[PDB]
Design a protein around this ligand. Structure first.
Ligand SMILES: O=S(=O)(O)OC[C@H]1O[C@@](COS(=O)(=O)O)(O[C@H]2O[C@H](COS(=O)(=O)O)[C@@H](OS(=O)(=O)O)[C@H](OS(=O)(=O)O)[C@H]2OS(=O)(=O)O)[C@@H](OS(=O)(=O)O)[C@@H]1OS(=O)(=O)O
Ligand SMILES: *[C@@H]1O[C@H](CO)[C@@H](O[C@@H]2O[C@H](CO)[C@@H](O[C@@H]3O[C@H](CO)[C@@H](O)[C@H](O)[C@@H]3O)[C@H](O)[C@H]2NC(C)=O)[C@H](O)[C@H]1NC(C)=O
Ligand SMILES: *[C@@H]1O[C@H](CO)[C@@H](O[C@@H]2O[C@H](CO)[C@@H](O)[C@H](O)[C@H]2NC(C)=O)[C@H](O)[C@H]1NC(C)=O
Ligand SMILES: *[C@@H]1O[C@H](CO)[C@@H](O[C@@H]2O[C@H](CO)[C@@H](O)[C@H](O)[C@H]2NC(C)=O)[C@H](O)[C@H]1NC(C)=O
Ligand SMILES: *[C@@H]1O[C@H](CO)[C@@H](O[C@@H]2O[C@H](CO)[C@@H](O)[C@H](O)[C@H]2NC(C)=O)[C@H](O)[C@H]1NC(C)=O
Ligand SMILES: *[C@@H]1O[C@H](CO)[C@@H](O[C@@H]2O[C@H](CO)[C@@H](O)[C@H](O)[C@H]2NC(C)=O)[C@H](O)[C@H]1NC(C)=O
Ligand SMILES: *[C@@H]1O[C@H](CO)[C@@H](O[C@@H]2O[C@H](CO)[C@@H](O)[C@H](O)[C@H]2NC(C)=O)[C@H](O)[C@H]1NC(C)=O
Ligand SMILES: *[C@@H]1O[C@H](CO)[C@@H](O[C@@H]2O[C@H](CO)[C@@H](O)[C@H](O)[C@H]2NC(C)=O)[C@H](O)[C@H]1NC(C)=O
Ligand SMILES: *[C@@H]1O[C@H](CO)[C@@H](O[C@@H]2O[C@H](CO)[C@@H](O)[C@H](O)[C@H]2NC(C)=O)[C@H](O)[C@H]1NC(C)=O
Ligand SMILES: [Ca+2]
Ligand SMILES: [Ca+2]
Ligand SMILES: [Cl-]
Ligand code: NA
Lengths: 418, 411
């Protein structure tokens, strides 16, 4: 059926599946070996000795070429997809990785599996928009204050839950190969248990781009020396899999994200909502403002009540809060000769045809006063009583009253009688 | 002071004095002795013999020149001033005397004094226009059928009271000097005792000019020295100036015309119509006990023109019938008594006041329409809005901003 609705047809909060938003995605890096072709040294241990090896990184040979595509391809522990940068991009220089998702995702984690020694200092940034503004998100480094000007392992308080935490944890050389770095956005967040009812954390987890900056790099004594190896050296960055798990952000009003008219990813919004993340909500559904989907309530925009007359409408906060936070939408351009907040009364020049229901389109008969016996041509919108002149009476003014006699005058049709 | 209104100022029927409309006025003649000066001859009597004479008539000598002026001048039984015609003007020749009065009188009598012997056949005509059409008014002759083709001494039917009658009374030669012929406009006339309620007779006596035609002259003697002429001492047409009972004097106009001092809110030459805006009741001739005045229209000081509808008058019980035209001052109705659509009666001012009808000052937010009640001025309020102009929220309703929904009900 539809996960956004129950078996009785009422709406319930729905959420897309959890996936790696980076699988198969293209990646943009500021470094990669191949142009020109160079060598790289890899130290592999065997019992106790080490003895480093040497290999060549061929830009053309698929069998010695490390393209950024290996970051988001199918990772296989028995046969890795290593991406290697250039040679000795040491501080202050830094290799940056930028991933564009083309859709607001609620990030749950960001993991980098390095087939070489993990970085001494890396930075993980996000983008709230679609690549214009970046925001700190996690930091790793042996000298937090010295390099990222962050205090080591800051205290996370409700006063500032979006703190970018720097840590000297996970920033160790060995394992010289296959080291992980996994950043969980909700770990240690004060209000992470009450996420649906914490907007600060919803903003904290939402992002459309992920930047990864590799600031410093681990080294040993081999740096100046003399045999520094001016053509390749063995210090470098290298990651075999880059994962960024999470969910497509739909504020709980979409079971799944689909492909746009222009191939862009967007929520298949339900509950009468619209917009890429089901933030706003469909036309004519503007009674009661838009809220996020919660486990307790579905909170879908409700349509305006216009007694089946007007089509457009529009939400009003004051009317909403002044009606007990129940109805705040007013109707627009009432058709069928009506008017008012809900198209509930007939406009001047017409009256309420009570014989027919207010929802009916003929619920507003015109005035139809009498050209001779009526003093005006604008009847009572409530009763349809035309203003009768002197001797004339009725609702349409087409007859004389008691003590008054009919006449052939257009001006004085009835006249009293003594 | 004015006889058209009593002490209380109530209008009572009034009439101009009874005068001789001929005195002074000039008569138009056709035959006057004097042209190539000739002579005549009057004849007297001595009991048996017919002693006659013969005198001269000059066209210049004051002491011998019988002019037409001698018909309407100061007349006295002594030193009598006589008009005379050229001698020998017997059948079928005519001697006419027209008199234009200038305005419609109600002729009462037509008198003639005859220095010569009275005529054998004479006729009195009149005009109710001004010399254009001339109708027969009385005939005098011995041979009526023969000459005027009128039945001698017929009867005045109520069906034809405007009938000229020929008669042989006053047609004798009896008085050679001083013959009187007088025509009473209402002799023989059936409804004469009810003149004041007899429109036929009122039309009959109305006349603007008068023509006396002399026809056959009495050859008296039977013996040349024929000398048979017409000679009238004084012509007296006595009557009142026709003002239909709404005037006490006739006076001279802004164009120098004899007309009526039309009172009783009437207008016109003979007070035959109502004055402007005094069209509430149909015009009638003043009666003794009635005075049928012209009554103005009550447009409560809001209209300049009035028009009369007889249908309205009759269904009104013969009361009013005047419909006002162009009700100004933002009013409408027969008598400009109610405020047209978009205005309302300000009952603080009086109906006659210019600002008796104010406008609709209906709040554009609190009102569902922009038309007052006209009687109350209240204007179509919407939902939780009260006030004549829909300017305030009601009880239990709270002000907002939204013009579509000004007031909203509280918890
Ligand atoms: O209807 S018109 O606009 O064409 O006016 C026609 C002429 O009437 C005058 C006065 O004429 S006068 O007798 O020679 O003094 O103005 C008057 O017209 C109407 C009422 O008379 S009506 O003929 O029944 O229409 C009034 O206007 S309204 O209230 O009906 O809207 C005038 O009042 S006002 O001047 O608008 O204040 C009324 O004049 S008043 O009330 O006596 O003061 C002439 O106007 S005038 O210039 O004051 O003399 C009109 O001729 S004109 O071309 O406007 O001059
Ligand atoms: C190495 O690390 C830094 C930060 O992690 C990466 O961002 C670079 O940082 C510097 C400032 O430290 C930026 O310099 C600025 O450039 C603009 C001109 O566009 C100028 O207006 C500023 O006054 C300032 O000088 C620098 O722009 C920024 N690098 C880029 C490409 O924007 C840096 O990218 C890392 N190195 C590499 C190769 O990625
Ligand atoms: C590995 O790299 C070498 C060169 O760095 C490639 O050998 C030749 O490279 C030149 C370009 O500089 C080409 O013009 C030749 O065609 C290459 N020789 C060939 C294709 O036989 C070498 O091709 C690369 N490995 C593979 C599989 O192509
Ligand atoms: C791991 O991948 C390598 C190569 O990607 C496999 O060795 C073969 O290498 C040649 C290169 O010319 C490829 O054409 C072959 O496709 C590779 N063999 C196979 C079965 O794919 C190596 O076998 C792979 N090891 C495992 C356990 O899958
Ligand atoms: C009849 O008509 C004229 C007007 O009177 C007379 O002419 C008069 O002739 C006398 C004789 O010389 C003159 O003295 C007068 O000048 C004329 N009269 C006037 C008034 O001017 C004519 O004679 C008259 N016949 C008689 C008898 O009076
Ligand atoms: C009639 O008016 C005339 C106007 O002149 C007058 O005629 C005079 O009559 C008397 C005798 O009656 C004579 O003595 C005179 O000669 C006439 N001439 C004048 C100049 O007076 C007179 O006033 C009146 N005549 C009569 C009879 O009353
Ligand atoms: C007799 O009076 C008759 C009419 O009563 C006169 O005849 C009319 O005279 C006027 C002249 O002003 C003409 O306009 C009319 O056309 C005449 N009537 C007809 C029917 O022709 C007449 O002048 C008098 N007759 C005589 C002989 O003197
Ligand atoms: C305009 O106001 C008058 C008077 O207020 C209306 O006439 C009556 O008003 C009372 C209330 O004031 C009502 O209860 C009656 O129903 C009204 N009619 C009668 C016969 O009493 C008048 O109807 C109002 N104008 C319009 C268009 O309804
Ligand atoms: C249309 O009809 C209704 C009922 O007659 C009018 O509303 C009432 O009008 C009277 C006026 O005397 C008030 O006393 C009542 O308080 C009104 N009812 C309510 C619930 O307030 C209405 O005014 C009429 N429309 C117009 C323009 O007069
Ligand atoms: Ca991989
Ligand atoms: Ca005289
Ligand atoms: Cl007749
Ligand atoms: Na080295």
């Amino acid at each position: 059926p539809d996960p956004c609705y129950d078996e009785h047809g009422l709406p319930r909060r729905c959420i897309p599946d959890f996936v790696n938003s980076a699988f198969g995605k293209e990646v943009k890096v500021s470094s990669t070996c191949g142009k020109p072709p160079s060598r790289y040294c890899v130290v592999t241990e065997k019992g106790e000795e080490q003895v480093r090896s040497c290999h060549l990184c061929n830009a053309s040979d698929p069998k010695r070429a490390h393209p950024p595509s290996f970051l988001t391809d199918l990772n296989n522990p028995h046969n890795l997809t290593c991406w290697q940068s250039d040679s000795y991009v040491q501080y202050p220089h830094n290799v940056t990785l930028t991933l564009s998702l083309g859709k607001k995702f609620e990030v749950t984690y960001v993991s980098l599996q390095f087939c070489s020694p993990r970085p001494e200092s890396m930075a993980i940034y996000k983008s709230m928009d679609y690549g214009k503004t970046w925001v700190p998100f996690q930091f790793y480094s042996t000298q937090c204050r010295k390099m990222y000007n962050k205090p080591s392992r800051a205290a996370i308080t409700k006063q500032n839950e979006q703190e970018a935490i720097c840590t000297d944890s996970h920033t160790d050389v060995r394992p010289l190969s296959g080291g992980l770095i996994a950043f969980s956005t909700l770990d240690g967040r004060p209000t992470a248990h009450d996420f649906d009812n914490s907007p600060v954390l919803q903003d904290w987890v939402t992002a459309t781009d992920i930047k990864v900056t590799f600031s410093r790099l681990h080294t040993f004594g081999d740096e100046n020396e003399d045999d520094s190896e001016l053509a390749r050296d063995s210090y470098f960055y290298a990651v075999s899999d880059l994962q960024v798990g999470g969910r497509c952000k739909c504020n709980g009003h979409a079971s799944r994200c689909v492909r746009d008219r222009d191939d862009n990813l967007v929520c298949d919004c339900k509950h009468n909502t619209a917009g890429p993340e089901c933030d706003r909500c469909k036309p004519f559904h503007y009674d009661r403002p838009w809220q996020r989907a919660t486990a307790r309530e579905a909170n879908e925009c409700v349509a305006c009540n216009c007694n089946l007359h007007a089509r457009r409408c529009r939400f009003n906060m004051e009317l909403y809060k002044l009606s007990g936070r129940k109805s705040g939408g007013v109707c627009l351009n009432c058709r069928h000769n009506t008017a008012g907040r809900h198209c509930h009364y007939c406009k001047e020049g017409f009256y309420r045809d009570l014989s027919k229901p207010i929802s009916h389109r003929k619920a507003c008969k015109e005035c139809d006063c009498h050209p001779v016996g009526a003093a005006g041509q604008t009847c009572n919108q409530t009763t349809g009583q035309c203003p009768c002149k002197d001797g004339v009476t009725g609702i349409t003014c087409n007859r004389c009253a008691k003590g008054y006699q009919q006449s052939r005058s257009p001006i004085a049709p009835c006249i009293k009688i003594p």
